[PDB]
Automatic annotation (TrEMBL):
Swiss-Prot/TrEMBL keywords: ATP-binding, Capsid protein, Disulfide bond, Fusion of virus membrane with host endosomal membrane, Fusion of virus membrane with host membrane, Glycoprotein, Host endoplasmic reticulum, Host membrane, Host-virus interaction, Hydrolase, Inhibition of host innate immune response by virus, Membrane, Nucleotide-binding, Protease, Serine protease, Transmembrane, Transmembrane helix, Viral attachment to host cell, Viral immunoevasion, Viral penetration into host cytoplasm, Virion, Virus entry into host cell
Main localization (coarse): host cell
Catalysis: reaction(s): a ribonucleoside 5'-triphosphate + H2O = a ribonucleoside 5'-diphosphate + phosphate + H(+); ATP + H2O = ADP + phosphate + H(+)
Species the sequence originates in: Hepacivirus hominis
Protein name: Genome polyprotein
Origin organism lineage: Viruses, Riboviria, Orthornavirae, Kitrinoviricota, Flasuviricetes
Length: 427
């Protein structure tokens, strides 16, 4: 238990997930008379530690807020951001501080930039999977390499039928077209194959007997888990056509990713993990398009100027022991700064709808509406514009590229031109 210091310290705390760090740790600090805040990315986790310690801490999530007068608060990073960040606490624990979702990143950076001014003595950056870590072996999971033999084609290797006859098995595949293709062949060999991915109702998975569930990362109880060892990963490309493209890329998975997928077996009883590849990237590198996400979340959810968002991301990049990324702070701040007078109605629909880049989407929707032009495609991304579809004609004033573009485009909008400058100035 890192002692509370005389001057402000940032501390790192690497210890297994579940053991001590969101639970025993804060309680020991409180037992010494300190005020302590414990930050977590997930709502369920924050309530999970709340309930478990209530046998009483303050609990601060978007959906539920309990104030109890306790010296211990469990918040998510998002609610922490919503509450204006640093008010009130001697000690702030950033739990699961490896997390590369926007919110967590803005959260920690916020804690890093502000904790000292606001009078804290200690910030503990806690996680069980700090940068460079690999997958540790699990007592309940036997791990067996797949070999070229077997009669089912699987990412260069093969799977034997014997391993997926009898019981429950989960096969992780990388995309959607690949889940369909694989489920289908198993149905054509008797086996009970069920594909799952974003845009399916969770009902379609049987609950009791034999199945081979072919899903992405979109109770389960599996006897076996089968992993293609790859992940579709969001990335940015500065393609100058006219500006940037948000697209995907399939990289070999990292440690936490291998963990997450292996952990779908061994749920108490024994488990089996069979792999396409023996290796893994180490964790601790994230794409530029995560920076774009921070500026997006900041502008859409957290009422931050681009500039404030930068101040918080700077603190995060000025701390050692954290996921590292390209320094595109001035670029990304530049971009969002030009993005003014969004339609609040469009913004509100792309937020509700769980869109990625809800701000950039609603902004391209805004620009489209005011021009009376259509969006770059009639995909699901552009749902907010359906009400107006009947009124919209001509070429799409294209700002950036978030997906497929079916409509002809104009490249001359002031916002398009402005962004273009940003990339020639800051890149
Ligand atoms: C998963 C991804 C698509 C996503 C979803 C949602 C958000 C925003 N967000 C995520 C969390 C975490 C939690 O639920 O505790 C959260 C909490 C409180 C607020 C909030 C509350 C008020 N009263 C005003 C404002 N402005 C914000 C927004 C939040 C960010 C990212």
């Amino acid at each position: 238990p890192p002692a509370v210091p005389q001057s402000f310290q940032v501390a790192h705390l690497h210890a297994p997930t579940g053991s001590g760090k969101s639970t025993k740790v804060p309680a020991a600090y409180a037992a010494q008379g300190y005020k302590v805040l414990v930050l977590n990315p997930s709502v369920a986790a924050t309530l999970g530690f709340g309930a478990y310690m209530s046998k009483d801490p303050n609990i601060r999530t978007g959906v539920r807020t309990i104030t109890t007068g306790s010296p211990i608060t469990y918040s998510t990073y998002g609610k922490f951001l919503a509450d204006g960040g640093c008010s009130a606490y001697d000690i702030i624990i950033c739990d699961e501080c490896h997390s590369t979702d926007a919110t967590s990143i803005l959260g920690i950076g916020t804690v890093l930039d502000q904790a000292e001014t606001a009078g804290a003595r200690l910030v503990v950056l806690a996680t069980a999977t700090p940068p460079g870590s690999v997958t540790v072996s699990h007592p309940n999971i036997e791990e067996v390499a797949l070999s070229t033999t077997g009669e089912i084609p699987f990412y260069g290797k093969a799977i034997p039928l014997e391993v997926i006859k009898g019981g429950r098995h989960l096969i992780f595949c990388h995309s959607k077209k690949k889940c369909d293709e694989l489920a289908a062949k198993l149905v054509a060999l008797g086996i009970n194959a069920v594909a799952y991915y974003r845009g399916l109702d969770v009902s379609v998975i049987p609950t009791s007997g034999d199945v081979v569930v072919v899903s992405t990362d979109a109770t389960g109880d599996f006897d076996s888990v089968i992993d293609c060892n790859t992940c579709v990963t969001q990335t940015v490309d500065f393609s100058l056509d006219p500006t940037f493209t948000i697209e995907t890329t399939t990289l070999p998975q990292d440690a936490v990713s291998r963990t997450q997928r292996r952990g779908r077996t061994g749920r108490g009883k024994p488990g089996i993990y069979r792999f396409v590849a023996p290796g893994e990237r180490p964790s601790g590198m994230f794409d530029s398009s995560v920076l774009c996400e921070c500026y997006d979340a900041g502008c859409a959810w957290y009422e931050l100027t681009p500039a404030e968002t930068t101040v918080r991301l700077r603190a995060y990049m000025n701390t050692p022991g954290l996921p590292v990324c390209q320094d595109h702070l001035e670029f990304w701040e530049g971009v969002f700064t030009g993005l003014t007078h969004i339609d609040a109605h469009f913004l509100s629909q792309t937020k509700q709808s769980g869109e990625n880049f809800p701000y950039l989407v609603a902004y391209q929707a805004t620009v489209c509406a005011r021009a009376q032009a259509p969006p770059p495609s009639w995909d699901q991304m552009w749902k907010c514009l359906i009400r107006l579809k009947p009124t919209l004609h001509g070429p799409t004033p294209l700002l950036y590229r978030l997906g497929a573009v079916q409509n002809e485009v104009t490249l001359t909008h002031p916002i398009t031109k402005y962004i273009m400058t940003c990339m020639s100035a800051d890149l």
